[PDB]
Amino acid sequence: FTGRPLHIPPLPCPFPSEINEHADAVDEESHTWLAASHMLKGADTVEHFRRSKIGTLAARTNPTVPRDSLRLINDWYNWLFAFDDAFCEGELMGHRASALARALPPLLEILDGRREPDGSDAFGLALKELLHRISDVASPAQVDRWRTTVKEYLFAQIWEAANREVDLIPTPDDYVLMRRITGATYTCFALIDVGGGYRLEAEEWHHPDVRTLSDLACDLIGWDNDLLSYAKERGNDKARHNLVTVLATHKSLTLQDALLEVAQMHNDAVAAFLDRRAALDRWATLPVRKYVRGLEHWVRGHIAFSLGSARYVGAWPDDTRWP
Amino acid sequence: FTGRPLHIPPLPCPFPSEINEHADAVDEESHTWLAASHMLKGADTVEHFRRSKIGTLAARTNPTVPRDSLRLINDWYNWLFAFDDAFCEGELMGHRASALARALPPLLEILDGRREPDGSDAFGLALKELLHRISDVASPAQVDRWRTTVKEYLFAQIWEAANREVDLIPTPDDYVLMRRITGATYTCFALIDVGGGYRLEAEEWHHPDVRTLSDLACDLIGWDNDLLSYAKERGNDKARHNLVTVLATHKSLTLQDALLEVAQMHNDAVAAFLDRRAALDRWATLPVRKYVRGLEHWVRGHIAFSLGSARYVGAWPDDTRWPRA
Ligand SMILES: [Mg+2]
Ligand SMILES: [Mg+2]
Ligand SMILES: [Mg+2]
Ligand SMILES: [Mg+2]
Ligand SMILES: [Mg+2]
Ligand SMILES: [Mg+2]
Ligand code: NA
Ligand code: NA
């Protein structure tokens, strides 16, 4: 970083900020699980994850769930953060669409419950375990809903590798569409009812009002991460997959104006969420209300986590003005 | 190909072979719709499609559905066949994973219903129309089920492009997995209840017995297509995405022995279907029985169509021995 100090715009959110009472114990347990997995090969990356307190994100985004549910979700978050850093955005696989695409089938077969992972397949061994643990506390329909979100997330990583390979910044329209699936947020939304020990009916899950609120929550989390992860992403492939970079490139903005435009889109998405929620509230069933409250806790908890996590704050210059 | 006449092995199954009474009328209507769409730019491809009688595949795979259901499904089949030939396998774009991957977002945005297609985007305009027509006769959960199968099918085309790019024949284990989604069969199974005017409940649809029968049927349709489409596929990228090529390459088989091994895998999958169907019979509700009869009609109808279609038969050498009934 060179140039005058950047102002990080606020990310206003009226949703309740809560945290699971089991945060400390489960964060430590889940980190131990990750450290034992060999999903991360470097002691530096493992320690970076320990300092990042991934279980604090789990606890803030799922504040109501029992301890066993929090531990399962926290393990899933650790899998995602590790996969993101070690595989998806790694130099080996992340710059070749063909290579990443051809590497997925064995992992997809593990996800389907069709294939035993090899002893050397750290991500496969962990994914098999998580599939079995989710299956113990979820209906076939809930498991397939989760599995579907994971497959789309995996396929979306090929699109990222494609952009890296051709050295292009994706266009705003392409980026905002694919950003809903490149971040695996839907895989976490898929575990809200499972974690809470309830089951949304197909008609509730797929209701246009519920899908709209899910999509807006997913936009907010994607764009909020883009704003706060911008500095650390600058060190890796020019922060290519980041709404700040995408808007700065395709609307020819200064970095400071791109940051403000991302905050404007956040404020617009919050307003859209509140408008649709008012309509949903007229019919919403008990499970639907719990799920939507789940989305609100996720959006707000994510912001609280990201403003304080060693994963993001360290890369911002000392003179950065935080909101 | 081989310097010795090939025999194509039979693909038997104990499923009823039926045809929708509206076959002739709907095939012609759906072909007219395809012609008007401009998804195909070459007169030669359009005429090849007319001769292929794609509506007879729709009619054989969906023999029970009312005329409006058959027309919607036939239009969808025409979309898939056109997309397969003109976009997925027809262009140099299909030889670079990064190019195909970057082409998909506009189409995904149309599928999600959040983008008006460009006036010149033939595939986009037709997909938007089909999404709306399916939405008129399907619950939101049924529409999302179909949408999910289409997205996986589209993503599966990048995997094919990846194999073309590095010029490798995929391994049997990778190929048999990805073949379930490269051929869009699940997108057609997704319209069985919709077409029939009924709705499988979530825990019926997602029941392990129903998923297993759907997966075995999907395997059968993929492998049966691979057997009969082998000859025409030699004319485009050395039949790379074909179980015959995959087994011949990776199991060091003659072409003749590879054809026989595909037929053996067909028979094994039919036997597995009958084994699992016996378990499903013990609990199956009427909607589940109609859906499973749907899978049976699809497998049998697809074979009946493929043995006779101008799409496949013409590429086989004159001395090829075709199977008995
Ligand atoms: Mg990433
Ligand atoms: Mg990342
Ligand atoms: Mg980020
Ligand atoms: Mg194809
Ligand atoms: Mg083809
Ligand atoms: Mg074929
Ligand atoms: Na939005
Ligand atoms: Na584009």
XYZ file of C-alpha atoms and ligand atoms in Angstrom:
656
model
C 0.000 0.000 0.000
C 1.097 3.565 -0.945
C -0.890 6.860 -0.957
C -2.980 8.794 1.614
C -4.831 6.953 4.439
C -7.986 5.021 3.343
C -11.352 5.508 5.142
C -13.154 2.133 5.602
C -16.863 3.123 5.376
C -19.248 1.863 8.100
C -21.461 -1.192 7.337
C -24.663 -0.167 9.183
C -26.851 -3.180 10.175
C -29.952 -2.990 12.463
C -29.936 -6.818 13.030
C -29.161 -8.142 16.548
C -25.461 -8.904 17.349
C -25.314 -12.097 19.494
C -22.713 -14.826 20.260
C -23.094 -18.522 21.223
C -22.206 -19.104 24.947
C -20.001 -22.081 23.774
C -17.704 -19.812 21.601
C -14.447 -20.264 23.652
C -14.590 -24.085 24.187
C -15.843 -24.935 20.640
C -13.413 -22.511 18.830
C -10.503 -24.337 20.625
C -11.951 -27.858 19.901
C -12.628 -27.030 16.198
C -9.125 -25.458 15.756
C -7.616 -28.660 17.303
C -9.670 -30.667 14.711
C -8.286 -28.450 11.865
C -4.658 -28.602 13.206
C -4.905 -32.476 13.334
C -6.422 -32.699 9.769
C -3.239 -31.850 7.718
C -5.613 -29.725 5.506
C -3.021 -26.912 6.103
C 0.630 -28.077 5.570
C 2.399 -24.958 7.028
C 2.761 -24.233 10.808
C 2.490 -20.470 9.900
C -0.962 -21.007 8.222
C -2.180 -23.212 11.155
C -1.102 -20.476 13.670
C -2.720 -17.730 11.482
C -6.000 -19.777 11.707
C -5.630 -20.152 15.548
C -5.218 -16.302 15.861
C -8.154 -15.713 13.395
C -10.557 -17.390 15.950
C -12.752 -19.013 13.203
C -15.008 -20.396 16.015
C -15.845 -16.762 16.985
C -17.406 -16.406 13.470
C -19.285 -19.749 14.023
C -20.518 -18.557 17.482
C -21.563 -15.036 16.259
C -23.335 -16.380 13.084
C -25.084 -19.273 14.978
C -25.706 -17.824 18.485
C -28.781 -20.002 19.437
C -27.574 -23.545 18.458
C -26.584 -26.204 21.049
C -22.867 -27.024 21.661
C -22.847 -30.178 19.397
C -24.396 -28.148 16.483
C -21.897 -25.269 17.026
C -18.932 -27.743 16.939
C -20.162 -29.332 13.630
C -20.744 -25.873 11.986
C -17.350 -24.587 13.331
C -15.584 -27.689 11.806
C -17.392 -26.919 8.477
C -16.213 -23.229 8.639
C -12.593 -24.431 9.279
C -12.886 -26.824 6.252
C -14.083 -23.863 4.073
C -11.380 -21.363 5.251
C -8.669 -24.078 4.798
C -9.993 -25.134 1.319
C -10.170 -21.439 0.272
C -6.515 -20.685 1.286
C -4.735 -24.048 0.564
C -6.558 -25.221 -2.648
C -8.927 -22.662 -4.310
C -6.623 -19.572 -4.142
C -3.313 -21.542 -3.927
C -0.681 -21.047 -6.692
C -0.772 -24.784 -7.692
C -4.502 -25.181 -8.644
C -6.010 -21.640 -8.434
C -4.531 -20.226 -11.720
C -5.675 -23.123 -14.027
C -9.432 -23.667 -14.732
C -8.701 -27.039 -16.491
C -6.581 -28.353 -13.540
C -9.106 -27.297 -10.818
C -12.109 -28.659 -12.857
C -10.359 -32.076 -13.377
C -9.407 -32.261 -9.622
C -13.084 -31.997 -8.406
C -14.609 -35.422 -9.390
C -12.916 -37.442 -6.548
C -14.142 -34.815 -3.986
C -17.673 -34.844 -5.594
C -17.717 -38.697 -5.280
C -16.763 -38.377 -1.534
C -19.566 -35.738 -1.142
C -22.024 -38.257 -2.791
C -20.935 -40.974 -0.257
C -19.731 -43.165 -3.216
C -15.913 -43.078 -2.635
C -13.482 -43.730 0.276
C -10.967 -40.856 0.543
C -7.256 -41.879 0.247
C -5.132 -41.606 3.458
C -3.247 -38.662 1.779
C -6.484 -36.723 0.859
C -6.766 -34.345 3.899
C -9.782 -32.394 2.450
C -11.558 -35.630 1.356
C -11.106 -37.332 4.780
C -12.516 -34.199 6.557
C -15.433 -33.790 4.039
C -16.402 -37.523 4.448
C -16.455 -37.001 8.273
C -18.589 -33.800 8.013
C -21.076 -35.478 5.553
C -21.546 -38.394 8.067
C -21.922 -35.983 11.065
C -24.469 -33.782 9.146
C -26.365 -36.969 7.994
C -26.708 -38.051 11.708
C -28.734 -34.836 12.531
C -30.402 -34.012 9.138
C -33.165 -35.577 6.949
C -32.177 -36.856 3.463
C -33.791 -33.660 1.966
C -31.702 -31.422 4.328
C -28.468 -33.386 3.492
C -29.142 -33.072 -0.311
C -29.926 -29.317 0.130
C -26.495 -28.878 1.854
C -24.724 -31.170 -0.713
C -26.285 -29.108 -3.613
C -24.903 -25.803 -2.132
C -21.413 -27.427 -1.712
C -21.344 -28.673 -5.375
C -22.237 -25.148 -6.676
C -19.529 -23.652 -4.360
C -16.921 -26.147 -5.752
C -17.948 -25.472 -9.421
C -17.762 -21.661 -8.716
C -14.012 -22.086 -7.830
C -13.348 -23.101 -11.522
C -14.826 -19.711 -12.613
C -12.376 -17.918 -10.220
C -9.442 -19.991 -11.640
C -10.663 -19.047 -15.186
C -10.376 -15.276 -14.317
C -6.861 -15.824 -12.789
C -5.779 -17.891 -15.875
C -6.835 -15.207 -18.469
C -5.741 -12.389 -16.027
C -9.122 -10.523 -16.200
C -11.079 -8.691 -13.452
C -14.662 -10.061 -13.738
C -17.370 -7.517 -14.801
C -19.795 -6.251 -12.084
C -22.801 -8.271 -13.459
C -20.802 -11.570 -13.719
C -19.051 -10.911 -10.352
C -22.157 -10.086 -8.197
C -23.917 -13.241 -9.591
C -20.973 -15.658 -9.010
C -19.982 -14.028 -5.636
C -23.223 -15.548 -4.173
C -21.622 -19.045 -4.681
C -17.780 -18.446 -4.594
C -17.971 -17.678 -0.805
C -19.915 -20.857 0.307
C -22.401 -18.689 2.344
C -25.368 -20.819 1.055
C -23.617 -23.974 2.483
C -23.804 -22.256 5.947
C -27.443 -21.001 5.478
C -28.280 -24.679 4.608
C -27.229 -25.642 8.215
C -29.365 -23.003 10.097
C -32.457 -25.291 10.517
C -30.188 -28.403 10.972
C -28.112 -26.584 13.671
C -31.336 -25.353 15.381
C -32.895 -28.877 15.425
C -35.865 -27.977 13.121
C -36.779 -28.621 9.438
C -38.136 -26.042 6.924
C -40.683 -27.730 4.574
C -39.818 -27.637 0.805
C -42.632 -25.004 0.305
C -41.092 -22.811 3.110
C -37.419 -23.213 1.962
C -38.214 -22.506 -1.751
C -40.808 -19.720 -1.037
C -39.876 -16.669 -3.208
C -39.822 -14.408 -0.053
C -37.411 -16.821 1.765
C -35.161 -17.190 -1.360
C -35.130 -13.341 -1.790
C -34.043 -12.765 1.873
C -31.455 -15.638 1.583
C -30.036 -14.057 -1.650
C -29.882 -10.497 -0.103
C -28.194 -11.904 3.089
C -25.710 -13.752 0.812
C -25.031 -10.472 -1.151
C -24.453 -8.549 2.141
C -22.027 -11.197 3.494
C -20.138 -11.372 0.130
C -19.799 -7.560 -0.241
C -19.005 -7.010 3.503
C -16.203 -9.601 3.247
C -14.968 -7.936 -0.005
C -14.750 -4.533 1.804
C -12.928 -5.886 4.922
C -10.791 -8.657 3.226
C -9.644 -6.175 0.482
C -6.254 -5.359 2.156
C -5.164 -9.022 2.704
C -6.420 -9.951 -0.834
C -4.189 -7.150 -2.316
C -1.174 -9.382 -1.368
C -2.593 -12.366 -3.394
C -3.428 -12.026 -7.153
C -4.237 -8.234 -6.976
C -7.555 -8.773 -5.017
C -9.087 -9.943 -8.369
C -12.220 -11.497 -6.723
C -13.373 -8.459 -4.723
C -16.237 -5.986 -5.446
C -13.801 -3.106 -4.550
C -11.405 -4.211 -7.387
C -14.357 -5.052 -9.750
C -16.004 -1.579 -9.310
C -12.634 0.331 -9.311
C -11.750 -1.457 -12.640
C -15.104 -1.445 -14.559
C -16.380 2.010 -13.348
C -12.831 3.596 -13.430
C -12.967 4.690 -9.731
C -10.280 5.622 -7.176
C -9.856 2.907 -4.474
C -11.511 5.306 -1.906
C -14.599 5.817 -4.210
C -14.806 2.011 -4.891
C -14.879 1.406 -1.059
C -17.735 3.996 -0.747
C -19.679 2.403 -3.686
C -19.433 -1.072 -1.987
C -20.821 0.513 1.260
C -23.659 2.127 -0.837
C -24.578 -1.331 -2.299
C -24.528 -2.744 1.304
C -26.975 0.036 2.449
C -29.229 -0.650 -0.626
C -29.220 -4.453 0.108
C -30.116 -3.858 3.833
C -33.057 -1.599 2.707
C -34.198 -4.332 0.211
C -33.938 -7.000 2.998
C -36.117 -4.902 5.404
C -38.738 -4.240 2.622
C -39.093 -7.985 1.728
C -38.967 -9.075 5.436
C -42.038 -6.820 6.137
C -43.982 -8.798 3.443
C -42.640 -12.219 4.666
C -43.653 -11.339 8.295
C -47.386 -11.333 7.231
C -47.394 -15.155 6.492
C -44.077 -16.456 8.015
C -44.386 -19.763 9.998
C -42.351 -20.438 13.225
C -39.550 -22.313 11.340
C -39.404 -19.526 8.662
C -39.152 -16.803 11.424
C -36.278 -18.749 13.143
C -34.479 -19.135 9.735
C -34.840 -15.386 8.849
C -33.656 -14.437 12.397
C -30.784 -16.874 11.549
C -29.990 -14.813 8.393
C -30.020 -11.532 10.456
C -27.650 -13.020 13.134
C -25.396 -14.313 10.285
C -25.148 -10.886 8.524
C -24.595 -8.933 11.810
C -22.280 -11.553 13.436
C -20.180 -11.703 10.225
C -19.591 -7.874 10.362
C -18.687 -8.044 14.116
C -16.232 -10.951 13.423
C -14.622 -9.400 10.293
C -13.910 -5.952 11.906
C -11.834 -7.721 14.652
C -10.370 -10.937 13.076
C -6.567 -11.386 12.651
C -7.569 -12.850 9.223
C -8.415 -9.320 7.900
C -7.248 -6.440 10.204
C -3.443 -7.100 9.967
C -3.176 -6.307 6.197
C -4.709 -2.763 6.528
C -2.076 0.034 6.838
C -1.575 1.604 10.333
C -3.033 4.994 9.182
C -6.319 3.389 7.879
C -9.392 5.166 9.416
C -11.791 2.438 10.730
C -15.485 3.460 11.058
C -12.916 -48.182 -38.135
C -11.239 -51.484 -37.041
C -10.664 -53.418 -40.339
C -13.111 -56.082 -39.019
C -16.941 -55.663 -38.881
C -18.218 -54.408 -35.458
C -21.262 -56.015 -33.787
C -23.296 -53.587 -31.605
C -24.474 -55.565 -28.533
C -28.159 -55.491 -27.451
C -29.280 -53.204 -24.549
C -32.162 -55.215 -23.022
C -34.352 -54.019 -20.103
C -37.679 -55.354 -18.706
C -39.331 -51.869 -18.921
C -42.399 -51.062 -21.078
C -41.689 -49.442 -24.514
C -44.495 -46.860 -25.054
C -44.983 -43.688 -27.161
C -47.104 -40.561 -26.479
C -50.058 -40.451 -28.974
C -49.113 -36.746 -29.712
C -45.587 -37.703 -31.071
C -46.042 -36.580 -34.762
C -47.880 -33.255 -34.071
C -45.641 -32.140 -31.121
C -42.324 -33.182 -32.842
C -43.264 -30.874 -35.805
C -44.394 -27.994 -33.468
C -41.231 -28.258 -31.276
C -38.949 -28.428 -34.401
C -40.758 -25.282 -35.746
C -40.088 -23.626 -32.309
C -36.366 -24.642 -32.527
C -36.142 -23.214 -36.116
C -37.751 -19.872 -34.990
C -35.391 -19.658 -31.902
C -32.255 -19.300 -34.169
C -30.311 -21.397 -31.572
C -28.936 -23.236 -34.690
C -27.387 -20.903 -37.348
C -26.571 -23.601 -40.004
C -29.320 -24.893 -42.392
C -27.482 -28.304 -42.374
C -27.780 -28.619 -38.510
C -31.489 -27.494 -38.541
C -32.314 -30.133 -41.244
C -30.262 -32.823 -39.342
C -32.434 -32.017 -36.236
C -35.688 -32.244 -38.342
C -34.523 -35.715 -39.620
C -33.442 -36.801 -36.049
C -37.145 -36.473 -34.892
C -36.215 -35.229 -31.349
C -39.999 -35.144 -30.572
C -40.126 -38.986 -30.914
C -37.494 -39.165 -28.073
C -39.730 -36.797 -25.979
C -42.810 -38.948 -26.882
C -41.062 -42.312 -26.077
C -39.486 -41.031 -22.775
C -42.763 -39.309 -21.631
C -45.536 -41.544 -23.082
C -48.250 -40.730 -20.404
C -48.100 -36.872 -20.234
C -50.772 -34.545 -21.714
C -50.039 -32.715 -25.034
C -49.019 -29.392 -23.316
C -46.526 -31.282 -21.032
C -45.089 -33.168 -24.074
C -44.654 -29.869 -26.040
C -42.847 -28.144 -23.090
C -40.559 -31.221 -22.568
C -39.932 -31.512 -26.376
C -38.951 -27.767 -26.522
C -36.562 -28.427 -23.563
C -35.044 -31.496 -25.375
C -34.570 -29.308 -28.521
C -32.806 -26.648 -26.312
C -30.404 -29.321 -24.846
C -29.587 -30.971 -28.253
C -28.974 -27.488 -29.798
C -26.806 -26.365 -26.796
C -24.850 -29.675 -26.973
C -24.079 -29.323 -30.741
C -23.804 -25.504 -31.219
C -22.149 -24.369 -27.904
C -20.645 -27.286 -25.855
C -19.044 -29.462 -28.630
C -19.407 -27.203 -31.747
C -16.876 -24.386 -31.006
C -13.144 -23.943 -30.105
C -14.523 -22.262 -26.888
C -15.335 -25.881 -25.797
C -11.546 -26.693 -26.024
C -10.646 -24.170 -23.224
C -12.110 -24.597 -19.679
C -11.424 -20.890 -18.831
C -13.431 -19.694 -21.921
C -16.517 -21.930 -21.271
C -16.455 -21.132 -17.478
C -16.462 -17.326 -18.173
C -19.327 -17.698 -20.766
C -21.783 -19.282 -18.215
C -22.653 -16.394 -15.775
C -24.949 -14.538 -18.281
C -26.898 -17.830 -18.839
C -26.980 -18.555 -15.027
C -28.447 -15.022 -14.411
C -31.261 -15.756 -16.986
C -31.908 -19.188 -15.326
C -32.201 -17.318 -11.934
C -34.781 -14.954 -13.581
C -32.739 -11.794 -12.666
C -31.595 -10.821 -16.257
C -33.466 -9.938 -19.504
C -31.541 -11.777 -22.299
C -29.916 -9.710 -25.137
C -32.007 -9.548 -28.380
C -29.313 -11.646 -30.196
C -28.854 -14.282 -27.363
C -30.807 -17.213 -28.952
C -30.061 -19.725 -26.081
C -30.771 -17.097 -23.350
C -34.118 -15.985 -24.921
C -35.273 -19.654 -25.323
C -34.114 -20.613 -21.746
C -36.035 -17.600 -20.256
C -39.215 -18.702 -22.146
C -38.821 -22.339 -20.896
C -38.178 -21.154 -17.271
C -41.471 -19.121 -17.418
C -43.446 -22.021 -19.046
C -42.109 -24.522 -16.396
C -42.890 -21.967 -13.578
C -46.562 -21.813 -14.831
C -47.048 -25.603 -14.153
C -44.541 -26.295 -11.277
C -44.315 -25.309 -7.556
C -41.294 -23.159 -6.529
C -39.545 -26.294 -5.052
C -40.083 -28.164 -8.406
C -38.709 -25.124 -10.386
C -35.618 -24.891 -8.055
C -35.146 -28.715 -8.396
C -35.074 -28.333 -12.247
C -32.879 -25.153 -12.004
C -30.317 -27.035 -9.786
C -30.049 -29.906 -12.377
C -29.546 -27.331 -15.222
C -26.733 -25.502 -13.276
C -24.859 -28.811 -12.567
C -25.276 -29.754 -16.293
C -23.839 -26.338 -17.377
C -20.892 -26.619 -14.873
C -20.277 -30.238 -16.125
C -19.590 -28.756 -19.642
C -16.490 -26.954 -18.146
C -15.128 -30.371 -17.014
C -15.495 -31.647 -20.644
C -13.701 -28.472 -21.892
C -10.914 -29.140 -19.281
C -10.332 -32.684 -20.745
C -10.328 -31.261 -24.341
C -7.818 -28.515 -23.307
C -5.157 -30.993 -21.925
C -6.033 -33.604 -24.661
C -6.531 -36.504 -22.170
C -9.212 -39.256 -22.144
C -10.851 -39.129 -18.669
C -10.405 -42.154 -16.308
C -13.341 -44.607 -15.841
C -14.037 -43.466 -12.191
C -14.017 -39.705 -13.081
C -15.992 -40.288 -16.336
C -18.859 -42.482 -14.921
C -19.388 -39.879 -12.103
C -19.377 -36.773 -14.393
C -21.355 -38.561 -17.195
C -24.433 -38.447 -14.837
C -24.441 -34.586 -15.242
C -22.703 -33.973 -18.679
C -25.794 -35.436 -20.499
C -28.548 -33.372 -18.711
C -30.630 -36.564 -17.973
C -31.438 -35.312 -14.390
C -32.960 -32.104 -15.979
C -35.481 -34.415 -17.794
C -36.169 -36.628 -14.683
C -36.878 -33.286 -12.869
C -39.929 -32.764 -15.208
C -41.495 -36.295 -14.824
C -43.872 -35.305 -11.921
C -44.362 -31.748 -13.420
C -45.234 -33.288 -16.845
C -47.581 -35.848 -15.184
C -49.323 -33.031 -13.202
C -48.317 -34.412 -9.730
C -45.745 -33.382 -7.058
C -43.403 -35.733 -5.127
C -43.010 -34.485 -1.508
C -39.415 -33.548 -0.435
C -38.817 -36.776 1.590
C -40.285 -38.873 -1.338
C -37.986 -37.143 -3.925
C -34.896 -37.323 -1.599
C -35.637 -40.899 -0.290
C -32.396 -42.940 -0.766
C -34.355 -45.637 -2.751
C -35.748 -42.956 -5.177
C -32.294 -41.241 -5.509
C -30.632 -44.683 -6.156
C -33.180 -45.674 -8.898
C -32.766 -42.155 -10.471
C -28.919 -42.510 -10.407
C -29.043 -46.062 -11.944
C -31.492 -44.851 -14.686
C -29.147 -41.857 -15.315
C -26.137 -44.266 -15.634
C -28.144 -46.450 -18.096
C -29.140 -43.472 -20.332
C -25.532 -42.101 -20.356
C -23.943 -45.509 -21.170
C -26.652 -46.464 -23.773
C -26.081 -43.071 -25.486
C -22.269 -43.639 -25.339
C -22.670 -47.066 -27.074
C -24.924 -45.829 -29.940
C -23.506 -42.239 -30.316
C -19.892 -43.639 -30.426
C -19.681 -43.709 -34.287
C -20.833 -40.047 -34.830
C -18.649 -38.883 -31.866
C -15.471 -40.233 -33.625
C -16.106 -37.349 -36.130
C -15.739 -34.698 -33.326
C -12.717 -34.625 -30.914
C -12.016 -38.430 -31.242
C -15.116 -39.438 -29.126
C -13.232 -38.274 -25.954
C -16.428 -38.165 -23.778
C -17.662 -41.721 -24.406
C -17.506 -44.794 -22.095
C -16.369 -46.899 -25.159
C -13.272 -44.632 -25.667
C -12.710 -44.409 -21.838
C -12.720 -48.255 -21.326
C -10.778 -49.001 -24.595
C -8.073 -46.452 -23.526
C -7.769 -47.163 -19.749
C -8.525 -50.959 -19.749
C -6.487 -51.629 -22.976
C -9.552 -53.147 -24.772
C -10.196 -53.502 -28.530
C -13.117 -51.295 -29.722
C -15.225 -54.523 -30.031
C -14.417 -55.600 -26.398
C -15.132 -51.990 -25.171
C -18.641 -52.115 -26.822
C -19.292 -55.509 -25.076
C -18.047 -54.155 -21.666
C -20.433 -51.114 -21.972
C -23.299 -53.638 -22.639
C -22.126 -55.712 -19.590
C -22.214 -52.533 -17.392
C -25.734 -51.796 -18.821
C -26.957 -55.309 -17.747
C -25.301 -54.885 -14.265
C -27.108 -51.497 -13.760
C -30.511 -52.958 -14.892
C -30.042 -55.821 -12.329
C -29.161 -53.228 -9.598
C -32.305 -51.208 -10.597
C -34.486 -54.379 -10.110
C -32.751 -55.114 -6.715
C -33.428 -51.549 -5.391
C -36.967 -51.389 -6.965
C -37.863 -54.501 -4.840
C -36.981 -52.488 -1.645
C -38.884 -49.349 -2.881
C -41.990 -51.536 -3.670
C -42.378 -52.187 0.132
C -43.184 -48.470 1.018
C -43.729 -46.654 -2.366
C -46.683 -44.174 -2.458
C -48.675 -43.814 -5.762
C -46.734 -40.630 -6.807
C -43.383 -42.490 -6.205
C -44.625 -45.507 -8.309
C -45.634 -43.109 -11.184
C -42.153 -41.445 -11.000
C -40.309 -44.845 -11.024
C -42.525 -45.978 -13.996
C -41.384 -42.635 -15.535
C -37.693 -43.700 -15.115
C -38.509 -47.142 -16.698
C -40.279 -45.528 -19.741
C -37.319 -43.074 -20.087
C -34.637 -45.839 -20.138
C -36.632 -48.074 -22.588
C -37.870 -45.172 -24.798
C -34.316 -43.721 -25.072
C -33.005 -47.115 -26.396
C -35.957 -47.429 -28.877
C -35.246 -43.841 -30.138
C -31.404 -44.135 -30.320
C -31.377 -47.434 -32.362
C -33.383 -45.663 -35.147
C -32.433 -41.924 -34.991
C -30.647 -40.191 -37.942
C -28.624 -38.480 -35.112
C -26.679 -41.761 -34.454
C -27.230 -44.497 -37.124
C -25.577 -42.813 -40.183
C -21.994 -42.688 -38.756
C -21.749 -46.526 -38.253
C -19.911 -48.344 -41.108
C -22.116 -50.294 -43.614
C -20.767 -53.699 -42.383
C -21.765 -52.979 -38.706
C -24.056 -55.751 -37.301
C -26.970 -54.115 -35.372
C -28.603 -56.082 -32.504
C -31.897 -58.102 -32.473
C -35.099 -56.845 -30.682
Mg -12.028 -17.485 -1.983
Mg -10.181 -16.146 0.183
Mg -12.639 -12.031 0.721
Mg -22.362 -33.521 -25.025
Mg -23.033 -34.626 -27.973
Mg -23.179 -39.237 -26.900
Na -28.903 -7.583 -4.745
Na -19.566 -11.890 -19.845
